Amino acid sequence: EAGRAALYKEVYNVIASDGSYVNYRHMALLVDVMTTQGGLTSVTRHGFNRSNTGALMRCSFEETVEILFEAGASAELDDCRGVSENVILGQMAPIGTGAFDVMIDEESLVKY
Amino acid sequence: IFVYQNNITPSAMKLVPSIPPATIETFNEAALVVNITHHELVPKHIRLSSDEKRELLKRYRLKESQLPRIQRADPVALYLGLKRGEVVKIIRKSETSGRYASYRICM
Amino acid sequence: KAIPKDQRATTPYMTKYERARILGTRALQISMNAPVFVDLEGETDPLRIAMKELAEKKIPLVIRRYLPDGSFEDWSVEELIVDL
Amino acid sequence: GQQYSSAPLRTVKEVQFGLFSPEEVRAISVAKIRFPETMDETQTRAKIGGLNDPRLGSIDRNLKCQTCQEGMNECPGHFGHIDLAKPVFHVGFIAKIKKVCECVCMHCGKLLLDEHNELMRQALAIKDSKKRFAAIWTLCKTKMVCETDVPSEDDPTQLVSRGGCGNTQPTIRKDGLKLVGSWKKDRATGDADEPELRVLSTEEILNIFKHISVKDFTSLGFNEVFSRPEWMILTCLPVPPPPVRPSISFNESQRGEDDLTFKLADILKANISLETLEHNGAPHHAIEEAESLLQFHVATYMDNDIAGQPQALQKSGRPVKSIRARLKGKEGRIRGNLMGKRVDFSARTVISGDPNLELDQVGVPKSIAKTLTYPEVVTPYNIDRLTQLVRNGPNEHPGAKYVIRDSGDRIDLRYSKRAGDIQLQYGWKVERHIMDNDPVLFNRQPSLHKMSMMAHRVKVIPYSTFRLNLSVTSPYNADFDGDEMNLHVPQSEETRAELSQLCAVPLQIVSPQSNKPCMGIVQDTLCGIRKLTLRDTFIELDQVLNMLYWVPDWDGV
Amino acid sequence: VSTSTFQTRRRRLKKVEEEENAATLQLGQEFQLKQINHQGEEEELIALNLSEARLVIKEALVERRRAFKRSQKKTREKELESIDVLLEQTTGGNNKDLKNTMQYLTNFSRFRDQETVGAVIQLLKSTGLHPFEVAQLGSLACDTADEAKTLIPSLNNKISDDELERILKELSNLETLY
Amino acid sequence: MFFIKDLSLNITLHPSFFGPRMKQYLKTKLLEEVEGSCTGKFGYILCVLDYDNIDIQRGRILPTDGSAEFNVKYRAVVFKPFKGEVVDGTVVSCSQHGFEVQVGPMKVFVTKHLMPQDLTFNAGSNPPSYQSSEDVITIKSRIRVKIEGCISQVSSIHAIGSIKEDYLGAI
Amino acid sequence: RLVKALEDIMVHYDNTTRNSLGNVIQFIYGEDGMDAAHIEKQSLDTIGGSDAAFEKRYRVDLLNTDHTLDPSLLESGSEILGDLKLQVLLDEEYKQLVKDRKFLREVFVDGEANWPLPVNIRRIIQNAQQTFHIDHTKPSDLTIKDIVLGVKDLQENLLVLRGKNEIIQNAQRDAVTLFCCLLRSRLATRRVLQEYRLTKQAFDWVLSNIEAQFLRSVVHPGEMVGVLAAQSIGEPATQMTLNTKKVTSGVPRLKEILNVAKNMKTPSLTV
Amino acid sequence: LRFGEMERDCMIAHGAASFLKERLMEASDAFRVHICGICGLMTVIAKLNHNQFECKGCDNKIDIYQIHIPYAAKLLFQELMAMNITPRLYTDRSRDF
DNA sequence: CAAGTACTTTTTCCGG
RNA sequence: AGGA
DNA sequence: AAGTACTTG
């Protein structure tokens, strides 16, 4: 929790070095992303990309084939909850406009 | 709690798990000199009883995994004597909200 | 398996995203010669018609808002507020 | 486009990964794949019952697929197989195969450590399928003897038997594609001094992996249905169909066969060498020799960019293009064909700025709007208008390129003996020219920003540039010094909504990045507005009257 | 598209066993005595007998014509011609399946009325037999409890020769004239 | 036999039909598809029951085209014939090979070898008939047959029967 | 790298910040639950100034002859004097404002008063003035109960998380805390009366505008903050390069941070 | 023109779910494969002029669906199988979460 | 417990 | 080889 | 190569 402080304290001082302004919430999120895992989780192919997200999701960065080899071998199952996983499947991603569903209601329809 | 000056031999250290449901902890006297908790960067960490934890998970529609984590070896976890699965409520100040409450599960 | 209309917690207001999809969807329907629920006061563009349809709150659509866990809250265009 | 299928349409919810069962490969296969011969059934141009269409996909374009009569577009390709003369390790699992040996008995196929060792029952408790196989391995790698009797979970006096088998376990280390172990030994209590150096054959490891208990391998990485250890070692080889390894046939009598078509023929060849070698008068050394060659071919087919040097270069100096290489990022399947794509309905030209355009508008040249097309559906609220665009043809600006009927058949207004008399019907699509006030996505690479792509209102202009407003220079970053920019055209009345409603330039005025506007008045205006707003600035009646007229939304006051 | 049921079995990869189906009460993977109706609740299998069946369809096809003229506002040889007319009013006529079925039922039906069919349903649905056995007893008529225990082999030990003989007796008494 | 099975079809409506007479088209489109159908899975689908109470549910609008997919939860009368099931029927056709018997929606055929010996073909009759020492089976004849096996075909479950066993044969 | 690490992160319909798995990154986006565009660097008056200056601005004392609001400010000005029942509310008010100052001094330890907060209250009141034509001579039609209470009750409607239970309700309180310090700072009785000179309707309109404008200012579930944050840090990094104690900084330092490099170029303690 | 990985990023930042899908599918790749329901593989020998489906190996003729996916995915999938890896695709769920 | 060996990307888009 |  | 991860001495 003090490591989170030291993280943002530093990240922010790098941005403010140039003079440029970034709204807390952005660095705070990134700092909070690295942090949550339980300790400092490097934004590297051996930190976040080595975490337990999607398979196709993880593969779309750095260990492409190598990730897919362990996929088949340990029989990983894909959520398809991830943005990237849908992009590879040509599915409307569950983001912004696709993060809910639309339905017609015969009740409201016959009312008008 | 056992306060040791320099070390505890690998011989004696084997006896720590030996007597459950009771629990034993080892704290180096030199680490205890200054209280971490008091520091500028460390916020309020609070233990959650099974009752509170089950409620936190019900309320945020979570799985025990889906919660942010704290190491068992975390200086604060050791201080409060966190056990694996126990939840901490983290109360930091905010330049955005004023106060923010986070939660970390112990692994 | 769903949430009853009384136990609903989601924004009583329509999200920018919902708006753009209801408008899109009704336009995509109106264009596909779907039945227009309002008086086209000389209107010819389906998105302009979908905007009118939405302003009169006469769109037959229901937004199924999914929560992270799986369960969802069902809301209607009629029952949502539009500050957008 | 692709013709109606009676099948129920659905979306991929789960991607269940696994390994191909040598038994599955054999079932699902529409052919084997008996010949290294590409085709040319006795030089006579057509395909051979050996490699490519021995029932597979289809070449010729004029030849309908010999299985599903579909052919070319619509037909995928049908998978093949080849029964390998001897088992071979799969290049990828080569080290996981090694790590599994390092964990199990090389005689009975039982875990070297079990629930009786404390650290083991603790590492077995790890819920994760990888982290657990990680601990299991570090623990078992050091256990060099399959244990018969183990001291019970109570006393060191009562040594109770778990699994039997005495066996001294090897010390496995890879020799590039080959696994070679070194057995501890015994001779007069010590020994090594000089142990036993025997190379472990694919064939034996295969058999050991078969004997690993379901409960056992399941505690290691594996799963009983999708990925059994015994499947990392290949017995049946899936032969991909033409659409994976296409015959790029230049002119008439000139093959043009893909690299993978060569590496397969090479694997075929190498297999027929080993098969005959062993069925016939086995010179033994020459088998374990032609074996290692087939194990190599199968390796450099999947991965040619291996540690153990030989890059199996195609005779031309150029190395053979592996399947691994095909998918590996920044260009190549994932990063370059799937995550990023070359797109239709796109335009790029040199940009110049205009001070007589609205922030949100983009000047598109007459050619570019005549080139780019929008699929309008024949609706009563346009039928008449759309018919005039159809009459206008594809050379007049406000015109149309094609009419697509309900009958899914494209009418080319550009030629079609009927482009004059063509009476539109409701539910048809008129692919019309991009018009003034249509939404478009204007973009400027890099695109390190939400603001580096915004929806603009079209305004068809003369002259070959993209004319954009000056106050919208700052977000794209672009200047006008030989600057070029992209433009994408929406297709759905739903996508138009998407753009106009979330992407539009006036929406992006206040940046979330810095909670402040990301556009402002710049240069000529920025300097002139200072000049105009001092106490010294005074304007004559003549000019005030003009300046007032210049404001579009002036009251008349 | 195609039709599906309430039996949600998630048969992942594991194709087979495709165990046969015999009147050794081993019916389908769809026709278990324990089959959940769409209301979510568990229900038993519904097996109809020729007449129990005629009176179900005759019923639904009547109420269909009742809703068709609602929304449109703004003796064997003699019942066979009567039914063949109701089909023309409600069904697509392309359903030659239902046309034959209605004739087959109208001819092969054991009991003419929903009161007599009611009575049969009590007598049978007391024995504690699988609905397929229960239907086959009311469906087709026997004499020797053996005629039954042989044509419905599924019984055999399921009942007393004497009990089945008493049921078969009372079935032929309920047997409505033609 | 003849069951009451609870089924569900997934029908996709073009937005052109998003009028109030929608439940009406949807209910009608169900019986267009489902009624008169025949799957090996459920057998011959013969009649959709309770037209009035057929459930429509909320229809999901389909991402890049206006069409909305409804899951029509319904209940119907089915006929899935089994092996070993003894069925009464009327003869249809008669050859030197055997004779076909109509049983409700489907036809069941009985080979010369699936009948007794005494009963033997007679070409010399209008229409053709199988003559026995005591009996005669012709075209319109009533017969009780035992289904020996089922062949699940296209849009018709056909079968093969026996009248050789005891209590079977003519009635 | 950033973009790939953060892609899957978005705000769901529970106002929770989560990924592909659904694991919570933040419980409320940016600890406050507000969209980034809707924020403006406002000023917390309560924080700075002398302890004496504070008193002069915020303290209303209907019991003291010189610390009452003169009847030039409000109509009730004469009949308001002494009322112990009312002075309970102005004592209640002043004691909460005191609490705020001590709390803000807890958050911003340096005393920085300029913080980015949703709803420009300055501009609401500014624009209220020209809307209603505020005469800084005539007295206000408000009562102490109109100002004191109206504010108290606008606070109730400033909703971020909606749920009915102590976890969500006590979390709503948390995500809203700071804005209210600002709202209380700018809507205290003595301020409203001397400075703003707001009428009844003028005040009633101010409140409904802050409420509606606040409700607008919140984040939209579906908002892709993973990609947002990644780009809002990634783009600025590129403008440190396309342009041009002694510790390693900028493009190279940021590299060390993201990589979580053990061997920094300039490790420095500060005691 | 290329709608690069970078350009997909900002499209996601915007929330333009449909437009990003439309770009990737309709204005590019967009294929229609037939997948078996037992083993989620493109093993379907879809003779669609006769409405005959079938995935031999799975003995199937009934549990078959059609899917719309980029032709590059269709490929990637065939390329993965070519390397003994099975990307089985299912139009149902199991994990729930 | 120590080096030693083994490994992966390194901005985007746009004519012989 | 080149361009922003 | 820069940086790290891995097993091997």
Ligand SMILES: Nc1ncnc2c1ncn2[C@@H]1O[C@H](COP(=O)(O)CP(=O)(O)OP(=O)(O)O)[C@@H](O)[C@H]1O
């Ligand atoms: N390699 C690169 N990658 C991405 N963007 C680039 C780039 N090179 C140049 N640019 C873009 O093009 C511009 C620089 O082109 P230059 O030839 O340097 C003229 P300039 O230096 O911008 O005039 P100036 O002196 O007024 O700044 C920048 O705005 C930048 O964003």
Ligand SMILES: [Mg+2]
């Ligand atoms: Mg430039």
Ligand SMILES: [Zn+2]
């Ligand atoms: Zn084919």
Ligand SMILES: [Zn+2]
């Ligand atoms: Zn052993």
Ligand SMILES: [Zn+2]
């Ligand atoms: Zn299959």
